[PDB]
Amino acid sequence: ASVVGTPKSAEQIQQEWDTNPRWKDVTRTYSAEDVVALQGSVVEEHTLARRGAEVLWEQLHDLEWVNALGALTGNMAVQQVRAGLKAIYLSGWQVAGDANLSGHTYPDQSLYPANSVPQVVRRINNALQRADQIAKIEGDTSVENWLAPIVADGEAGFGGALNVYELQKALIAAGVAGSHWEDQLASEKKCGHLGGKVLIPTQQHIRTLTSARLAADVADVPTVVIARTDAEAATLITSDVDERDQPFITGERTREGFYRTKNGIEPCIARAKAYAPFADLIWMETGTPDLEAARQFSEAVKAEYPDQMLAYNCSPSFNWKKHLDDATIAKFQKELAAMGFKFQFITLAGFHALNYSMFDLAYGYAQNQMSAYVELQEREFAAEERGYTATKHQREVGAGYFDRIATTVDPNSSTTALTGSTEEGQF
Amino acid sequence: ASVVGTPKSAEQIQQEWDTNPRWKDVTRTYSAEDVVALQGSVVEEHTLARRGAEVLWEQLHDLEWVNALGALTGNMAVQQVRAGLKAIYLSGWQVAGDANLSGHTYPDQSLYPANSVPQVVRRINNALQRADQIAKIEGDTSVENWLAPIVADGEAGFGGALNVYELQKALIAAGVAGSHWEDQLASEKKCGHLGGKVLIPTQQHIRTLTSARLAADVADVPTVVIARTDAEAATLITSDVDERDQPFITGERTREGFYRTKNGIEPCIARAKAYAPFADLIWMETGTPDLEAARQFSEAVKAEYPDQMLAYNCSPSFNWKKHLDDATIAKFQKELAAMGFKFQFITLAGFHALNYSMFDLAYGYAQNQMSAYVELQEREFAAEERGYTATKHQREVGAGYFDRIATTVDPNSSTTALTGSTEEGQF
Amino acid sequence: ASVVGTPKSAEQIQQEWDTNPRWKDVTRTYSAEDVVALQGSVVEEHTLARRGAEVLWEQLHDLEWVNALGALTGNMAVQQVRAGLKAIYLSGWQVAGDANLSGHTYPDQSLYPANSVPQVVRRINNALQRADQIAKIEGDTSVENWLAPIVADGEAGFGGALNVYELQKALIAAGVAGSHWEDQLASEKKCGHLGGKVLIPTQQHIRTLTSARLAADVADVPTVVIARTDAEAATLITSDVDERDQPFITGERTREGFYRTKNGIEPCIARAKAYAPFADLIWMETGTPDLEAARQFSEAVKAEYPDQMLAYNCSPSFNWKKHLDDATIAKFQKELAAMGFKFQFITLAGFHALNYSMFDLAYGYAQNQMSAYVELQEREFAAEERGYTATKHQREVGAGYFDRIATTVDPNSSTTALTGSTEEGQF
């Protein structure tokens, strides 16, 4: 026996819940006692999940707004933080298309193994940690906080409340700062911009949001919980059992047993209000990037929860210039921030940056061989004045940090890496 | 019992060795019966490994030369093939830096789990397969062979001859076409352009190459085997046991017991000749991109093995414009090709494309939010004239393909995905 | 391009479906052309999946009946075969409790990652392939077929028809011979002997069986598809949309929106008949091990489908002697076989053997240290007259096979393993 990791008392938890401003608008339908009962006799400390959640929350209140780009590899997250961003978005869509545990390429329908996003959260954290270790030994203060908070996609939870619970717990173990959960049927989950969506009853999503906060409380971390509604476009729901949903039920039924329901901003506003006591940020998927519709939603929701922060998906699934002109595109995010959209993100930023850059390099390489690659290397060199450091790739991935480990173990090692390298001699 | 997967008899195998031109210049120090002894009573078919190896060998003989770019994600390989490339290079350096099974970022020192590259080989093939499947239902003939052969990094084998064997078997199970192996001490392995390299005796690498060939025979696939030598820059060797290495041994020793050895192209040529009978292609790492030095190595080897094909690494570890003028850079691969370097590749192409593109997007996003992303999207729409297809990311990852699966199971499903998607209504 | 892996034409497929007795009683609501449309231009051969499926089919018709024990580790399966069993059962319950990819211990509620069972199938196959490779070099003919067919748990599909499709595809790539699918709501899935079960409509499960068949056809292997119904104990159903389910619907509903239904053998018999055209074997979970009830179910079903084979679960979830006496327990399987249950299995066999055996050893060890282990070693020595071979653990796991590979690569190697070993000198 030991006292390392001993659980706090229910009294202690109740107290934090009652005094920490963090929980000011947070309703919990279970007790402090209930949380303790599930903690066993040892509570593991989740440093990155704690730090990340705390940082994210402060930024949400200290900045005009927090934006982010989707990252599907650790290096992507490193470049986003090097360029100055202060949060990382981990898209489940990108994980399905190019970074999931089945090894397959999938459309965004919850087809991949449920521990896939948690593994990428752990991966992004490992990469940021390596960047952080490297910055320290290089005396580089170019970046204030390498461990930027990660907001990750919990999709529709991959099942019922217990699958939701295990996903949240695994995201936390991996070091996530925030997670989002949507009101769709897991078995028919869709990207918000794909058709064929099936909502689940308002209450069921409340059970999901409740389960996610519960896993966060049992793991002793203040994870930011985000509720997403897919009701703007969904015309199906699994059941009419919930009276808050009935006003939209048409009565028509499908062969699968689903119910037709009237889609639009109205159902989104209703669900948003019902989810508000259980969500630190609320988000409604929309069919076009429209400041006016965004404002309607914002005023409507804040008219009942003035302090409710909102999230917005600046989706690559929109044909941006088909809808907006440069002036509006230019002010898009600043406008939204004014409305209360404090977390903004380009979900598929990484998928497109990766696919395009490689198509572009490879197309050139197919025509001119080395000339096309040299053009890129020169662009990298030119970007150094902007803060870019990866042209010197050995140090970027830690060659200098491992050299430090090697010489700490054996100062006389004759097998260190950077000394005598072409990096040291040509860059 | 059944007859499915019945092992060939030793005679059938001998016959192929004796009559297939593929084995024309291949020495096997073990016998056909030795192969059969290790096969048990059932031999799995490795369709992709077989097809990729067959296609790779053909292209090496049919094209002026075969070039490639390193890919670390499945989508990367899909873009390389979409852009017209006919082979994919899978760099172990890239896997160490952003795609390995430990989840950590590492310098190129064989620090990651030994099954990492095989997993990426499997991923790459899964992605090319999906592209293949999609092009079929889309009636897209723009690409003749989506399943481009993959040439992957076996580094220094992660141990002894048995570790080499297991890595080759795992690469094959995953569908690899070719694999390369270097003459370095596994426990001190380095990127060819890092310092602190340690060679192993000439005969030890012959054992490695024999092991890689044996695993391919026991698996019954004609995998391409590439032999790499790091003697150009390496100043240390593990032992002076081999008479062929003794000529360069200086007598001086390091505190770890390594032997100092004279590095240069002379040691490279000597090892290249020793490796030939056991190598489909031969590669020597160099400290600079030099057409001259390349010719020297080439003539020297062909002087004794006229038909021996060579491989060359157009490495991002070189500061290209610092050593060459645009005229030479532009003719580089063509020139090398005339010398006999039939397989050429830019090892770290993916690391740079991915890191620079995300840095460029993020920096612009950090300043001007959506304007920066819209610039990228317009670039993608512009690239469609060149054959780029990823702007429509839903179909790119298979939304239409899984829609076809869904409608084959139940043509009247009310939850298919492309109908009513923003991709349909906006692209 | 190459011709390796070219798909069969639609005509060829249609022919096999038309002439092979394997497809005798098999309904496909999709066409042969539909299958070809989903295969892209290359079809990977799945050697063990095909061989296993063919063998299992043959055995189901040539033996009195086929039995099996649940296997959760590769060695478990190897011992099962060594002892004479001719098939392996891969329980999802066991995967949940001690062998899934989350690393966590879980109750049987579909909480683990969807690719867990496929990984265990690949594991079992690799273990069997090693025992086969060893028996060969040892001249051991004690076993005719080391590659016993594996029957694996596909639970409730982990989602919708596309999740079922991917699970089946992954099971096949891993080398499975047959897979079973149940009519429960995946998000609320339960072990068949736990409470809180919820059925899905009859047509929805036909969609699941159709999807499982479609994936096998696309992969081009004769997988055995098994249908399981949970209607004997389930008192809940997601919807009353299907007319075949309505007769059992009571009208009462839960706050979740579920529908109460009347359970018993009646709904199981009706469901069994509906699934019959879509299942190579049918299985109904029961609350106790009752030969009467079993005959009751069998007669009903064969009354309409005479050639329909059934499968029976002799579950550890039953307190066997609390229900039956030794005479009945002794003939249990032989009787069931008469009734037409050609596949019988003890789902949690491995979990109990492993938990009990270790508690027993650890208990004695905590008391008597080495004496307790020696008691076990002597039992293993004793069991050698029965065929047991693991007392000699080094050769059991392949030390001798690998020594052969080492000597094939270098007959003079001074680092082989069995020579000089305590196994060779003390056993």
Next chain:
Amino acid sequence: ASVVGTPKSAEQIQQEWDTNPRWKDVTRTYSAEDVVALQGSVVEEHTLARRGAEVLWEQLHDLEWVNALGALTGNMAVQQVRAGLKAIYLSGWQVAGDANLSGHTYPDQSLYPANSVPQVVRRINNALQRADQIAKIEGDTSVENWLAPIVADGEAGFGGALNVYELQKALIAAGVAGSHWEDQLASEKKCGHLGGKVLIPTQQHIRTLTSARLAADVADVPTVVIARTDAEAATLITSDVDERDQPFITGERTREGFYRTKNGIEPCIARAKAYAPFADLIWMETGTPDLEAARQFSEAVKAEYPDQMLAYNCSPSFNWKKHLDDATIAKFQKELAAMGFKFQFITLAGFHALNYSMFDLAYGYAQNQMSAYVELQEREFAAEERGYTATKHQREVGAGYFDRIATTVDPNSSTTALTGSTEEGQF
């Protein structure tokens, strides 16, 4: 930025090394400043590793001796603890044979992916945590510490000092309490009781032990570091550079370049003395279970390091009764303990209990079907008086724990598992 995870100052660390008795006989050839330089700006807390290491250290000084059995699944560890054991042994040999990330069965030669043991360490902790959670809700005080410390096999480090460092880091992240490292060449690694062992220079093993301490220091946890020497039977060494090794080097070399060296207890005493300043425990592999030889090694080492604790492998690789008589077998561990062997373990206990228990079950099942299984089931009911609880497998894997989560989320859920279960109604 946040305060969470801020690194300690070099001064604070130095102070700990200076005053904590834990570090009484520990030599660290690097500085505290060196440790801090490698920690970046945030240090993750490793609760289980910290707790387990502290607990194991206390136990080693509070109990007559600490013993254990090799566990290869989480359920085995659970049983070992339910049965009274206070430590768990994680064998690399068992991982190679039946629990490694490649999915393959291997002999003990460092063939599996290097992150395999860490994942098994994480699995065991997860399982023990599940039991701790269940015990708390069942109010079971039967076990005082479910989180028993785990001592894991680090083998030969899978490479150089950097591979050692990463393996140690990964073992800590997974929650290990102690790790052991042997003086063999990783590429030729062997189970201590197989032939073909190649030693590395005494100084190289000191480097390994130093790297293992550094990784624990950077991770901020007091991990128990164990040194193993294989010099009793090894007759080869990689180099003769170390003057401490030279008295045993014969001058004769093999064709691979290895040096022949005279084996025995003498060079083991020499190596142990050299390793003592860098090892919390020292272990020498022996060819037979000989209390006299044990005493000889023990006395020789303590003559110079009286407080040095020792470890002993009661290997299943020995034919116990062939060497010892019942009386000695009975007092074996008690005697060793008196000599100073405070950690004793049966490396392959899990392998044997698993392989034997299944073969037995399967053999009896192939003959008497249900009768055989029934025999096992009553034995389990019988073992309940001794403290066994797995007969009731649903609660054993957390069915009741997840029911608690379910009702915490929704008290009115109609889909909980234990109510209406055959376990509840028949056990």
